[PDB]
Design a protein around this ligand. Sequence first.
Ligand SMILES: [Hg+2]
Ligand SMILES: [Zn+2]
Length: 255
Amino acid sequence: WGYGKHNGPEHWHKDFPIAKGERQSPVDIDTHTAKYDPSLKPLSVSYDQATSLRILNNGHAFNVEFDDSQDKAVLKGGPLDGTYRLIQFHFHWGSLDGQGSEHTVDKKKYAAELHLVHWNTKYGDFGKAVQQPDGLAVLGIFLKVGSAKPGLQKVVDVLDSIKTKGKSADFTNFDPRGLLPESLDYWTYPGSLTTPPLLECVTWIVLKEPISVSSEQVLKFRKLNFNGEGEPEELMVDNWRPAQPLKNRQIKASF
Ligand SMILES: [Hg+2]
Ligand SMILES: [Zn+2]
């Protein structure tokens, strides 16, 4: 699987039949239909004690991995039940600034989308969490192009080191708090992961407020390679999945 013409999102169903399941993601957030829900608690992000380990190029995006051996970086509150531990963060971006995000807002597409992945700590590990309806929690943040994001520059600067598929680089003392918008206002719905295996185990929390990144920071994402070192060069761009049918599901708003 990939994002090309022959192995793109339209082909995933052949190997991952859940592709046309009942709670697939991403989706379009119709803000006039989203339901203001008063029973939604504020989001609670405890990330001061986070421990980054490394960054990888897995062939479909780059991953920043965290130590999830202990309750170091956790998300709670909101529509969530229990504590979810941060395991990794990654992005989805486009070849141009008018596309890149996965979720859309009133059909509006953003330059990129940041996903913070967390697993429910009553299931013990990541692998068990993906076997449950409430196993994961992904915090989604949209990236628009404007002014630079001081907080994202360290990520940007090590991209050169993991240009191709399989590369990895030590990447300690990175604070994810530098990627959060000011407001924690969100929309939430029951979904799935956006890349195969597309396991419908996720509780989405899409932040209303976008972060701005500069043109040159986004430009560096686009210099990555899907391909392995020594193979023809295929730029890592447009690694996003098209919006799926909401199919009965209701999108709730915390504001
Ligand atoms: Hg699941
Ligand atoms: Zn993602």
